[PDB]
Every structure is written in C-alpha cells, then in structure tokens.
UniProtKB/Swiss-Prot annotation:
This is Thaumatin I. Taste-modifying protein; intensely sweet-tasting. It is 100000 times sweeter than sucrose on a molar basis. The keyword Nucleotide-binding does not apply. Its main location: cytoplasm. GO terms for cellular component: cytoplasmic vesicle. It comes from Thaumatococcus daniellii. The lineage of its organism: Eukaryota, Viridiplantae, Streptophyta, Embryophyta, Tracheophyta. It is found in: Cytoplasmic vesicle. Belongs to the thaumatin family. Transmembrane segments: none annotated.
Amino acid sequence: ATFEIVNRCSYTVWAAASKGDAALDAGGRQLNSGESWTINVEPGTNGGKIWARTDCYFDDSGSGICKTGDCGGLLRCKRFGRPPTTLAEFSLNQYGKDYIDISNIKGFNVPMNFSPTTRGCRGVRCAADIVGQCPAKLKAPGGGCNDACTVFQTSEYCCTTGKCGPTEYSRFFKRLCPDAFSYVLDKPTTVTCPGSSNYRVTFCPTA
C-alpha cells in the first residue's frame, strides 16, 4: 500500500512510520514545508502508525533528539514515538478490509488529515488548535498537549484494567476533535476501507 505523507505546515516536521517492533519503509524522513514523501507499507500490516515529530536534530549517522514524537533518538524510526503525538493509525488487509483512525490517546502535537486516495470510504481529520487551547495541566513544556495518562499515570486515565470512563481531560480532546479517539474506550471513530486501499496523511491540512 502507498501512503503519501505531505507536510502542509509552515514548519519542518520529521515524519515517522512504525508498527511498534519495526519500521515501515525507511521509518522516518525530514519533510520541509510543502514536501511530500511516499512510502510503501506491506499488505497485512497490523497496528501501524504514522506521526509527525517536531524540533528535531540528527547527526550524520541519523541519531539525535526530537521535542515531540522522538523514537529512541533515531531519524529512521523502528519503534513508536514519545508523547505528545497525534497518531494516524491503520491495520491493513484484515479479513478483506482496511481500518483507519486518528487518535489523541497519546496526546496531540500537529494537526492531521488521514484520507484514502482510492475509492470507497471517507477520511478522518483532527485539525483544531489543540495545542493553543490545551488545558494548563496537559501542556507539554517541550511542545504539544499531553494526554492525561501520560501526565497522571492513573488506572482511570490509562484504562489499565479495561474499565474506565470519559474524563474532563478526554472530553477536551473530543470537543476539539470529535472524529479522533480521546481515550481508550471511546466510542470508535474507525473507518472501514476497501482492502488494499492507498492513503494520504497531510500535516496541517487547513494551512
């Protein structure tokens, strides 16, 4: 499957793509404002994610740091990134269909749109100014808006036992972005797409 990753933000981002225990394609790349990077994701990838990283430095070997979304200091991510990270999430070719969503369960850093480029389903978007409106207690000094699990580490926010409800913090994310997951047991906003669809992830879609 092809994923065209497009940075419409006015600032550089370092895109990242991983399924948690391995990179997808090269795993990451710099995207200046306006640039597009198309990756190939293997059919059947389950639990893949794409995100943006901000305020990064990398040396000639590809090792460094990012203020949001850092994946063990690598340009080419092999693992998931450090919150806060807006997440484009996907599982492909699961019994004939693909499944996509956007999630704020690990916080928000950069607005995004995640849409098919082929026929048969809708896209999803979380493009409100979550960082600007973030509750004071969730603001990440390094940048972005943390989720409550990251900040407070309680069973209620982290849904540790598989039982939890919405919270004042989850409702903030859900108010700003109804079409993204706001906590683990949120009413699902996952879209079913034809199996083997192709996609575009756009950072800062309204920019």
